[PDB]
C-alpha cells in the first residue's frame, strides 16, 4: 500500500526536465566555457560551483541546463552499437576441435592472435614487433566464421562483432566516425578482437570513378586505413577479416602494417573430410554398420559445409525409410547422388588469391 | 479598388514561394516547399486553379 506512495513521490522528482547533452570545445575563462551541442550549435557559458574546473578538459561529453545552457552533470563516454557488438554468442570451444582442419592455420592464428596478449615478453625480447592483423578467405573451402567464431568464444577476453552491412549509415557516412569511436572503445575495453565479415564491399578498389556510394565507401576506407597507419598503437586490438575474393581489397589493405598476416581456407583433404565426417556422424543415430572410407572415397572436393549438408541429406533422406537407426548404404545412396547434384551446381568455385 | 487593398493584407506582407505537389478535388491542394511541407489550401482567389498543374 505504501510502496505506491513511494513511486508517486518519485514522480515528484520526475517533474525535473532532462538536461541537454553537449561537448566541451575549450574554456575561455572559468565563467566562459566554449561548448557545442551534439546537434551542432556552439555556445559559451559559465557554470556552477559543483564542478572541478580541471576535471572539465576539452573534448568532454557533458549535460547542459535547458535555460542557462550550462554544465550540471556530465558523463565520460557512451556508444550504442558496442554492447551489440559484444552480444554475439557461439557454442564452442569444442567446435574448435569439431572443425577438423586446418591445423597449422588453427595454431598459427592461436599464436599471432592469443600470444601477444598473454606473452608480450617473448616478442619484446627478440626485438620483433607483434603483428596486429590477419586475413581469412573462403569459399575455396569454408569455415571462416566458424573457426574465427570459436576463437572469439574460445579465447573470450574482449571481442567485437562487425558485419560489413552495418557501416552503410545512409546519409553522412559517419559510420566512419563510428569506426573511429568504435576503435576508441576498443581502446577502452582493450585487449579486444575485431571481426570483419564480407570485406570485399568495404574493401573496394574505386577503379572506375563513379557515382556517390563508391566514393563515400572509399572515404570510410580512408578512415580504416589511416587508423591502421597510426599515429596509434594497435598492439592490444586484434582484427580478423573474411571475404570471398582477395582481389578488390586494394594494395592499401594488401599492404602489411595495416594487414600483417594472410591465411586461407582450402578444400578439405580426405583426412580432414574424414574427421569432420566423424564429428558429424556423432549426433545422428546410425545402424551398427558404419564405414567412413566409403563416403571418403566417394566425396571429393566438397566444402566442409557441403559435407555436413551431405550428412543431413543422408538422414533426411532416411526419414523416408522411417528407420530410427540408418544404415550407411542409404548414406552411400543419398549422400553420393545428391552430393553429386551439389557438384553439378558447383559451378565457378575458382577464386583469386 | 477595395479588393486590391483587401487581398494584399491576407497575402501580405511576406509570403513563401511554394511548389504545387498534387491537387485534391476539395480545392485543397497538397503542396510542397522546403522542406517536406505538405498541406491543404482551399482558396478561390487568383485561380486559374485548373491551369496550375503540379510541379
Amino acid at each position: 500500500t505504501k510502496q505506491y506512495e513511494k513511486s508517486e513521490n518519485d514522480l515528484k522528482a520526475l517533474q525535473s526536465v532532462g538536461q541537454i547533452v553537449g561537448e566541451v570545445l575549450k574554456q575561455l575563462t572559468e565563467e566562459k566555457f566554449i561548448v557545442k551541442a551534439t546537434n551542432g550549435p556552439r555556445y559559451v557559458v559559465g557554470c556552477r560551483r559543483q564542478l572541478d574546473k580541471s576535471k572539465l578538459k576539452p573534448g568532454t561529453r557533458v549535460a547542459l541546463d535547458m535555460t542557462t545552457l550550462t554544465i550540471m552533470r556530465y558523463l565520460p563516454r557512451e556508444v550504442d552499437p558496442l554492447v551489440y557488438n559484444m552480444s554475439h554468442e557461439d557454442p564452442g570451444n569444442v567446435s574448435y576441435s569439431e572443425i577438423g582442419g586446418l591445423s597449422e592455420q588453427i595454431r598459427e592464428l592461436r599464436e599471432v592472435i592469443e600470444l601477444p596478449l598473454t606473452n608480450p615478453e617473448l616478442f619484446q625480447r627478440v626485438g620483433i614487433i607483434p603483428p596486429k592483423g590477419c586475413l581469412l578467405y573462403g569459399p575455396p573451402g569454408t569455415g571462416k566464421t566458424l573457426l574465427a567464431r570459436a576463437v572469439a568464444s574460445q579465447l573470450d577476453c574482449n571481442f567485437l562483432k562487425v558485419v560489413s552491412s552495418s557501416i552503410v549509415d545512409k546519409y553522412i557516412g559517419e559510420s566512419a566516425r563510428l569506426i573511429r569511436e568504435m576503435f576508441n572503445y576498443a581502446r577502452d575495453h582493450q585487449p579486444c578482437i575485431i571481426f570483419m565479415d564480407e570485406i570485399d564491399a568495404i574493401g573496394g578498389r574505386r577503379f572506375s570513378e563513379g557515382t556517390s556510394a563508391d566514393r563515400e565507401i572509399q572515404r570510410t576506407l580512408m578512415e580504416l586505413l589511416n587508423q591502421m597507419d597510426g599515429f596509434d598503437t594497435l598492439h592490444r586490438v586484434k582484427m580478423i577479416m573474411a571475404t570471398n575474393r582477395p582481389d578488390t581489397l586494394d594494395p592499401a589493405l594488401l599492404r602489411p602494417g595495416r594487414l600483417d598476416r594472410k591465411i586461407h581456407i582450402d578444400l578439405p583433404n580426405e583426412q580432414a573430410r574424414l574427421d569432420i565426417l566423424k564429428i558429424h556422424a556423432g549426433p545422428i543415430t546410425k545402424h551398427g554398420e558404419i564405414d567412413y572410407e566409403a563416403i571418403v572415397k566417394l566425396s571429393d572436393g566438397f566444402n566442409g559445409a557441403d559435407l555436413r549438408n551431405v550428412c543431413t541429406e543422408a538422414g533426411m533422406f532416411a526419414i523416408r525409410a522411417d528407420h530410427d537407426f540408418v544404415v550407411q548404404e542409404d548414406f552411400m545412396k543419398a549422400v553420393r547422388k545428391v552430393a553429386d547434384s551439389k557438384k553439378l551446381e558447383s559451378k565457378l568455385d575458382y577464386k583469386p588469391v | 479598388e477595395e479588393e486590391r487593398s483587401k487581398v494584399d493584407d491576407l497575402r501580405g506582407t511576406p509570403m513563401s514561394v511554394g511548389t504545387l505537389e498534387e491537387i485534391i478535388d476539395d480545392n485543397h491542394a497538397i503542396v510542397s516547399t522546403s522542406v517536406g511541407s505538405e498541406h491543404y489550401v482551399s482558396i478561390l482567389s487568383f485561380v486559374d486553379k485548373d491551369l496550375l498543374e503540379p510541379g
Partner: protein, 220 residues
C-alpha cells in the same frame, strides 16, 4: 489503522495526475542506456540515462519515470511527451511500413491438387517445408538438422510460383511473399536494414516461410 485508505486516496489522486503526463507519449525517441552516480562537489546517487529524439536530437535525463532501466539495453520508440523528456511507457515493436509488411498472405485458393507431374519434386518440397513443422520430434530422435534454403529453378512453366504459394497456403503457418528487385534501393544499403527487419518479423512470427524470386537479379 484506517489511515491506509487515506494514503490510498492520495495514490489514486496522484495516478490521476499521472494521466495528464501520459497524454500523450507523443514523440518517439531512441535510447542510450547509462547508470551513473555523481559525487560532489554533498552526494547524489541514483541512475541517469541518455536519450535521443525523433528530430535527431539528444538529451540526458534522470532515469524515467515511469518504467525503470529494467527495460532496456539502449532501445528506441520509448514514448515521451514533448518538453517532458521523460518516458511514461516503453513501447514496441520495430518498424517500418513497406519494410514491416512486405506481404501478409491470407491464402491463395489454389493447392497442389491443381498441378500435376511434380509428385517427386513436390514430394521433395513438401518434405523440406513440412518436416520441421510436424516432425521436429523425429529430428530430435534422429539428431537431424533440417534444411533451410531450397533452390527452385526452371523455365516457366513449370509454374513453380503456384507450387510454392499454393503449398504455402497449405502450410497454415505465417507466409511472406517477396520480390527480388525490391531489395534494390535508393540509398546505400537500405536493403540491408530491409532484410534484417524481414527476418526480425519472421523470427517474431516463427515458424514462418519467406519466398523470394529473381534472386539472380540481385545475386550477380
Amino acid at each position: 489503522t484506517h489511515e491506509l485508505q487515506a494514503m490510498k486516496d492520495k495514490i489514486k489522486e496522484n495516478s490521476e495526475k499521472i494521466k495528464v503526463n501520459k497524454t500523450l507519449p507523443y514523440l518517439v525517441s531512441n535510447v542510450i542506456e547509462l547508470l551513473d552516480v555523481d559525487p560532489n562537489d554533498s552526494q547524489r546517487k541514483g541512475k541517469c540515462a541518455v536519450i535521443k529524439t525523433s528530430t535527431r536530437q539528444t538529451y540526458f535525463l534522470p532515469v524515467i519515470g515511469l518504467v525503470d532501466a529494467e527495460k532496456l539495453k539502449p532501445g528506441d520508440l520509448v514514448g515521451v511527451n514533448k518538453d517532458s523528456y521523460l518516458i511514461l511507457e516503453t513501447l514496441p515493436t520495430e518498424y517500418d511500413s513497406r519494410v514491416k509488411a512486405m506481404e501478409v498472405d491470407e491464402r491463395p485458393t489454389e493447392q497442389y491438387s491443381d498441378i500435376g507431374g511434380l509428385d517427386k519434386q513436390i514430394q521433395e518440397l513438401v518434405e523440406a517445408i513440412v518436416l520441421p513443422m510436424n516432425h521436429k520430434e523425429k529430428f530430435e530422435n534422429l539428431g537431424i538438422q533440417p534444411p533451410k534454403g531450397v533452390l527452385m529453378y526452371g523455365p516457366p512453366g513449370t509454374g513453380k510460383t503456384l507450387l510454392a504459394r499454393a503449398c504455402a497456403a497449405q502450410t497454415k503457418a505465417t507466409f511472406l511473399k517477396l520480390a527480388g528487385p525490391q531489395l534494390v534501393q535508393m540509398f546505400i544499403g537500405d536493403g540491408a536494414k530491409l532484410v534484417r527487419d524481414a527476418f526480425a518479423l519472421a523470427k517474431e512470427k516463427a515458424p514462418s516461410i519467406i519466398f523470394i524470386d529473381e534472386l539472380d537479379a540481385i545475386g550477380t
